[PDB]
Design an enzyme around this catalytic site. Structure first.
Site, mmCIF file in Angstrom:
data_model
loop_
_atom_site.group_PDB
_atom_site.id
_atom_site.type_symbol
_atom_site.label_atom_id
_atom_site.label_comp_id
_atom_site.label_asym_id
_atom_site.label_seq_id
_atom_site.Cartn_x
_atom_site.Cartn_y
_atom_site.Cartn_z
ATOM 1 N N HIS A 67 67.661 -25.683 -72.768
ATOM 2 C CA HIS A 67 68.937 -24.831 -73.216
ATOM 3 C C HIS A 67 68.466 -23.412 -73.730
ATOM 4 O O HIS A 67 68.799 -23.092 -74.830
ATOM 5 C CB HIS A 67 69.491 -25.693 -74.112
ATOM 6 C CG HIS A 67 70.273 -26.921 -73.821
ATOM 7 N ND1 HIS A 67 69.807 -28.069 -73.761
ATOM 8 C CD2 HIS A 67 71.501 -26.985 -73.147
ATOM 9 C CE1 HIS A 67 70.867 -28.936 -73.340
ATOM 10 N NE2 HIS A 67 71.726 -28.133 -72.978
ATOM 11 N N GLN A 268 68.894 -41.049 -63.042
ATOM 12 C CA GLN A 268 69.586 -39.609 -62.009
ATOM 13 C C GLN A 268 70.792 -40.263 -61.398
ATOM 14 O O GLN A 268 71.983 -39.905 -61.474
ATOM 15 C CB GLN A 268 68.795 -39.040 -61.465
ATOM 16 C CG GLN A 268 67.729 -38.052 -62.339
ATOM 17 C CD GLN A 268 68.732 -36.923 -62.949
ATOM 18 O OE1 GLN A 268 69.363 -36.229 -62.293
ATOM 19 N NE2 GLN A 268 68.610 -37.036 -64.152
#
Ligand SMILES: CNC(=O)c1cc(CCc2nc(N3CCCC3)nn2C)nn2c(C)c(C)nc12
Ligand SMILES: [Mg+2]
Ligand SMILES: [Zn+2]
Length: 312
Positions: A67, A268
């Site tokens: 981030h 995932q």
């Protein structure tokens, strides 16, 4: 006047959804300005003010694995590609607001979830009881807009300025994934019962919210080598948060426990099936020219299935 121009490969590939902005940090400001100039116009912002805003925004992203400033510009580029493929669907104020919202949407992110702040009893969790980090990102956005020489919206009227700051506020809050599930459910129903109406402001808000989720998750829409290497950054963060949960005496969720490194391929799969594919499917139903995002997501799901089958 002073148009920005990119080398040939970047000038062509920046228009595609799967573009990767590259490892040269110093070119990212010019890439963003290029995207404002083509999606919004050379008249949208004063160059000096816009450059100063971009540079303070960058300085307010932290050096965390995922981030960070590169995530900000990446999420802005996905929004650029949506806007450019849907020329006539968006107001002048939305074009202006949405690229800024995307650049600002994780300002001053620390690499921790809303849930870790609430369990740590961080002061931000007392100030903002839901969407904790997202209300903080919007607060940092207004802070930067109020610095001397940083008001890129100076030429808007009072009411136009208030409208653009409300587009930005809603767009940034919509990046709280906890909010996405119901937003996408409501959009699925409205599209399928044909009640979806883009002249209805509360409908636009939902459609912009979904666009924000799609741009925010656009790591799953890249070429496979980009997707796979970006996943490493995403987990570097989660797993540090797991460590911080274990220090508070709390078992982290599996997604955040580095002891479950070996299950990543299956984690995932779950995430593409539960979040990504639904997101880009509903987005493509509403905005047909975004189909290349769904196609690329499905390509990456199929690569994760190969990883599980030992074919990679
Ligand atoms: C807001 N985004 C996310 O929360 C997000 C999450 C994940 C994590 C997916 C996940 N892994 C696992 N574990 C279980 C034990 C081993 C692995 N469980 N689960 C649900 N990947 N991911 C991506 C690529 C992007 C773009 N975003 C994400
Ligand atoms: Mg965020
Ligand atoms: Zn983000």
């Amino acid at each position: 006047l002073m148009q920005f121009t990119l080398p040939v490969r970047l000038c062509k590939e920046i228009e595609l959804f799967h573009f990767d902005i590259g490892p040269f940090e110093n070119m990212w400001p010019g890439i963003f300005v290029y995207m404002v100039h083509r999606s919004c116009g050379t008249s949208c912002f004063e160059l000096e003010k816009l450059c100063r805003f971009i540079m303070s925004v960058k300085k307010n992203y932290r050096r965390v694995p995922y981030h960070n400033w590169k995530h900000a510009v990446t999420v802005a580029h996905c929004m650029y590609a949506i806007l450019q493929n849907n020329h006539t669907l968006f107001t002048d104020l939305e074009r202006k607001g949405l690229l800024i919202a995307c650049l600002c949407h994780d300002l001053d992110h620390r690499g921790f979830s809303n849930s870790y702040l609430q369990k740590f009893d961080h002061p931000l969790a007392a100030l903002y009881s839901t969407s904790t980090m997202e209300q903080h990102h919007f607060s940092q956005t207004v802070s930067i807009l109020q610095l001397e020489g940083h008001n890129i919206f100076s030429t808007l009227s009072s009411s136009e300025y208030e409208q653009v700051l409300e587009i930005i506020r809603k767009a940034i809050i919509a990046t709280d994934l906890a909010l996405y599930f119901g937003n996408r459910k409501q959009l699925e129903e409205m599209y399928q019962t044909g009640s979806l109406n883009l002249n209805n402001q509360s409908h636009r808000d939902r459609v912009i919210g979904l666009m924000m989720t799609a741009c925010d998750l656009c790591s799953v829409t890249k070429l496979w080598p980009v997707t796979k290497l970006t996943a490493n950054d995403i987990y570097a963060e989660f797993w540090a948060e797991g460590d911080e949960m274990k220090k508070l005496g709390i078992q982290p969720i599996p997604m955040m426990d580095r002891d479950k490194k070996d299950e990543v391929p299956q984690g995932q799969l779950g995430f593409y099936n539960a979040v990504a594919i639904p997101c880009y499917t509903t987005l493509t139903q509403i905005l047909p020219p975004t189909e290349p995002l769904l196609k690329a997501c499905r390509d990456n799901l199929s690569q994760w299935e190969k990883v599980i089958r030992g074919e990679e």
